[PDB]
Structures are given as structure tokens and as C-alpha cells.
């Protein structure tokens, strides 16, 4: 019998460190403002990169179906995490580009995302003359109407910011917990002290 | 315009074609007597995507032209838009008329950019009816040529026999 322990430094580097960085990126995208338009780029490029790592790893994993190696479970975890980052970035961008002309803000969104959460997340925010006078009155009324429209736009954008920060914290927590629960499961796989033989 | 993502789509399709080229290169023999059909078609679609990247770049250049950079001529518009298809009161009045003049100037510049945009859309529709035809015809010719490459009827052309039991 030959009880042999593997030295995974190669796999550590070539698959785990890149995935650590990708998972970092999948948390950052929630720190980005939707006004940039660089959010989908980040999220979906991270997904493409973890797909590249999957390709890398294809030619190096046993093709047996009695179990899934912790490495492929970790890669699928990061892949689904990036997927959910994409979904939630889409949601944030939807909320950010919402307006009264398209959406009516309900009361549960308002309550949750403007009253309850922001404290936790630390955000807290004579004919000619007659014509001329009527024209200037029209201008002023248009400007005040647009001010109200912008106020509602800003309420939607604040909802988006709050959801973004909540998702940031949630994703940091989830990624960290899963990564460390997978790495601890892997560090406690040590050959027995007696080989039973 | 910013957000349309023409070049994004085009160049990403080129990237996908490059990946497909890498995938095919893992499957074709390494002989240099004839070019196979799938590699020929990959080259064709890559050339087509290159030309369409060029066209998108040109349409973005034309649609985004301004009086500061380029002058729009009567002949260009006719070739595209017409053929192919007291001291206080004195201060008050001065300020008001200056405001109106500035507004008018801004809006006229806007109209000029709009004309450029429509020129671009016209070029775009024409270039589309050309690209659809080109790509479809290339694809179809190549692949029906493949479909028509069928084994002869006789094992030896001249020999009338089938050489079968």
C-alpha cells in the first residue's frame, strides 16, 4: 500500500487564486454606480473568466461520477455567485433607470429601501407683454414639474444605491463563508495516522 | 451613438469567430494542397465581420459629426437625404436677447447633428441590405456546394460496373 498525499500548490495557484480575484470582482460590481455603465462588463467578464478557468481545469480532473471534487464545487459556487451578481446588477440598473413615466413607486419598496435599511447600511442620503408673461409662466411650470420628476427619479436611484449596498454586504458574507467552509473542509482531509494495513 | 453598442456586437462576433477558428484548427488535417470548406467559411465570415466593423465605425463617424469638426455640404445631403432613398431695463433686455440668441445657436447646431444622424441611418439601411445578401449568399453557396459534393455513382468513372455482390 502507498498512502500518498497530494501537494496542490499548482492547482492552488492556477485555479483558486484567479477565482479569489474573480469573486472579489463579483463583490465590487455592487460598489459601482449605475451611471457608469461598466457594471455588466465587470460582472459578465468575471463570468467569462471563471468559464476560462473551467476550461483550464477540464483536462486535469478525473472523469468519474462517484462524487464532485471540492475544486469543481468551488468553481461552480463562484460561477453561480457571479451569475447572481449579474442578476442583481441587472435589478439595480432597472431600479436606477426607473421613472414615473414608466413605474409607480409602491409603498413596500419605499418603506423597506428608504426607511428601514439605510440606517443599518450607513447611507442616510400689454398684448406683447401678456404673451411674454404667459411664456415665462409656462417655463417656470415646466421647470417645477421637471424638478418633481427628478425628485422621483432620485428616489428610485436611492433605492438602487441601497439595494446595491445590501447586496454588497450580503455577497461579501456569502462568498467569504462559502470559500472558508470549502477550504476548511479541504484542510481537514488528512491521511489517517494508521493505514489500517 | 453612445449606448447603441454597434462595435461591441461586431467585434464580439469577431472574437467568437476567432474562438471557432481555434476550435476548427483542432479538427482539420494539416495538409496544404487545398483549403477546406469550414475554414474557408470562417475566413469569409471574419472578412465580413471586419467589413461590418468598418461600416459601423464609418456610420458612427458620420452620425456623430458636428460643425466644429466637419462641414455638411448641400451635395452630400442631396446625395443621401434626397437621392439614395434706463440702465436696469437695458441690462435686462441685453441679457434676455443674449439668452435667446445662445438658445437659438445651440438648437441650430442640434439640427445639424440631426441631419448627420439621418445621413448615417440611410447609409446604415443600405449597408444592411448589402450585408444580409452578402453573408447569406456566401454561407448558402459554400454549404450547398458541400451538400452537392456527393460520391460518384460508379466506383471507377469510366468502368460501367458497380463492383458490388
Amino acid at each position: 500500500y502507498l498512502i500518498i498525499q497530494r501537494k496542490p500548490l499548482f492547482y492552488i495557484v492556477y485555479t483558486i487564486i484567479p477565482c479569489i480575484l474573480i469573486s472579489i470582482l463579483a463583490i465590487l460590481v455592487f460598489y459601482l454606480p449605475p451611471d457608469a455603465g461598466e457594471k455588466m462588463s465587470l460582472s459578465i467578464s468575471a463570468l467569462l473568466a471563471v468559464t476560462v478557468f473551467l476550461l483550464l481545469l477540464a483536462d486535469k480532473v478525473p472523469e468519474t461520477s462517484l462524487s464532485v471534487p471540492i475544486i469543481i464545487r468551488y468553481l461552480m459556487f463562484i460561477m453561480i455567485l457571479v451569475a447572481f451578481s449579474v442578476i442583481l446588477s441587472v435589478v439595480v440598473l432597472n431600479l436606477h433607470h426607473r421613472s414615473p413615466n414608466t413605474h409607480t413607486m409602491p409603498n413596500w419598496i419605499r418603506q423597506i429601501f428608504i426607511e428601514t435599511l439605510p440606517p443599518f447600511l450607513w447611507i442616510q442620503r400689454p398684448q406683447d407683454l401678456k404673451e411674454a408673461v404667459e411664456a415665462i409662466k409656462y417655463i417656470a411650470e415646466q421647470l417645477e414639474s421637471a424638478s418633481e420628476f427628478d425628485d422621483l427619479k432620485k428616489d428610485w436611484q436611492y433605492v438602487a444605491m441601497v439595494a446595491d449596498r445590501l447586496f454588497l454586504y450580503v455577497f461579501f458574507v456569502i462568498c467569504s463563508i462559502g470559500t472558508f467552509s470549502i477550504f476548511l473542509d479541504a484542510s481537514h482531509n488528512v491521511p489517517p495516522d494508521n493505514p489500517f494495513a | 451613438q453612445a449606448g447603441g453598442q454597434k462595435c461591441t456586437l461586431s467585434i464580439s462576433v469577431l472574437l467568437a469567430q476567432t474562438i471557432f477558428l481555434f476550435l476548427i484548427a483542432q479538427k482539420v488535417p494539416e495538409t496544404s494542397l487545398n483549403v477546406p470548406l469550414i475554414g474557408k467559411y470562417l475566413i469569409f465570415v471574419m472578412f465580413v465581420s471586419m467589413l461590418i466593423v468598418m461600416n459601423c465605425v464609418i456610420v458612427l463617424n458620420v452620425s456623430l459629426r458636428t460643425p466644429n469638426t466637419h462641414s455638411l455640404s448641400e451635395k452630400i445631403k442631396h446625395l443621401f437625404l434626397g437621392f439614395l432613398p434706463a440702465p436696469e431695463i437695458k441690462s435686462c433686455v441685453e441679457a434676455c436677447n443674449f439668452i435667446a440668441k445662445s438658445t437659438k445657436e445651440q438648437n441650430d447646431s442640434g439640427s445639424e447633428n440631426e441631419n448627420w444622424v439621418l445621413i448615417g441611418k440611410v447609409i446604415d439601411k443600405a449597408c444592411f441590405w448589402i450585408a444580409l445578401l452578402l453573408f447569406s449568399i456566401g454561407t448558402l453557396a459554400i454549404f450547398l456546394t458541400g451538400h452537392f459534393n456527393q460520391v460518384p455513382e460508379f466506383p471507377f468513372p469510366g468502368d460501367p460496373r458497380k463492383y458490388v455482390p
Binding site: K7, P8, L9, F10, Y11, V13, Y14, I17, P18, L21, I24, L25, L28, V29, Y31, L32, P33, D35, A36, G37, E38, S41, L42, S45, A46, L48, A49, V52, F53, L55, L56, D59, K60, R125, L129, K130, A132, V133, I136, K137, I139, A140, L143, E144, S147, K154, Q157, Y158, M161 | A2
Partner: protein
């Protein structure tokens, strides 16, 4: 103002991932050492991930508004006054109705201009963060690359095998 910072950086990281892929299928899966090239790949991928994080911070600052953020005097002192100097950066009811209406228009226009002024200050803060990150990273990138690849280029073999043997084991100069 060009939505191309994160695109640039993350596409660079994708290229680096491709190079990592090409490298992974050139060496054996041994664990007695990290290959110099894999060392450099990890270093540079981490540095580019940091570049991406920094560009994200810069964008966050750039796109702040009085409606969502406050321009603390500390941040002004830091990223508009002090560091730029260090980094060496470049620089009759009807008539009454009409009167009240023009006054309201002026009020709103002044508010909008204050808004835009604070937005410009946030943008300058972003530019300062940007030059800082440049002057901190670009040297690091260049110097780490040079360090690694001279440490690699200066790995000539020992010029004499069998450490405790002055003999060169050469056909030219035998011993006896």
C-alpha cells in the same frame, strides 16, 4: 466620462487568464516551487484586480451627487487641495406674477449650478485618486516585472557541477 476604464482593466485580466491557461499546460503539476511565470501571472493578475477595484472607487466618487453623498471638508482638503499639489497636477398681479416666475427660474438655475459645481469637485476627487493610484501602481508593476525577470535571467547554472568539486569535468582539461 468615457465608460471604458473597467472594460479596459477587466479585458486585460481576461487576456491574463488566457495566458495563465496557456501556461498551465506547459509544466508538470508539481508543488516544490511556483514557476517564475506563474509567480508573475499571480502578481500581475492581483495587481490588475486591484487596478479594477481602484477604478471602481474612482467611478463611485466621480458619480456622487448632493442627493446621495456629502462632500466632507476632509475629503476636499485631501483630494482637492493637498494631494493635487503633491502629485503636481494641472491647476399689477400680472407683472408681479411674471416677476415671481423669473425669480423662481433664477432660484432653480442657481441650485442647479451649485449641484454641478459639487459634481465637478467630486470629479476632481476622482482624478486625484486616479493619479495617486497610477503613481503607486505603475512603478510597482514595472519594478516587479523587472525584478522577477532579472531574477530569472540571472539564473545561469553554477558554472561548476558537484558543488564540492573544483573539477570542471571537461574534455579539454582532464586531470591525469
Amino acid at each position: 466620462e468615457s465608460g471604458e476604464k473597467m472594460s479596459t482593466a477587466i479585458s486585460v485580466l481576461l487576456a491574463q487568464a488566457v495566458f495563465l491557461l496557456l501556461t498551465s499546460q506547459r509544466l508538470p503539476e508539481t508543488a516544490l516551487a511556483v514557476p517564475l511565470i506563474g509567480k508573475y501571472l499571480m502578481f500581475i493578475m492581483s495587481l490588475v484586480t486591484g487596478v479594477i477595484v481602484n477604478c471602481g472607487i474612482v467611478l463611485n466618487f466621480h458619480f456622487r451627487t448632493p442627493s446621495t453623498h456629502v462632500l466632507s471638508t476632509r475629503v476636499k482638503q485631501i483630494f482637492l487641495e493637498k494631494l493635487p499639489r503633491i502629485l503636481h497636477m494641472s491647476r399689477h398681479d400680472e407683472i408681479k406674477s411674471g416677476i415671481d416666475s423669473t425669480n423662481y427660474i433664477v432660484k432653480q438655475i442657481k441650485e442647479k449650478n451649485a449641484y454641478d459645481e459639487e459634481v465637478g469637485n467630486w470629479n476632481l476627487v476622482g482624478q486625484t485618486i486616479d493619479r495617486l493610484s497610477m503613481f503607486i501602481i505603475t512603478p510597482v508593476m514595472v519594478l516587479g516585472t523587472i525584478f522577477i525577470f532579472v531574477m530569472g535571467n540571472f539564473n545561469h547554472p553554477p558554472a561548476k557541477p558537484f558543488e564540492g568539486d573544483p573539477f570542471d569535468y571537461s574534455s579539454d582539461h582532464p586531470r591525469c
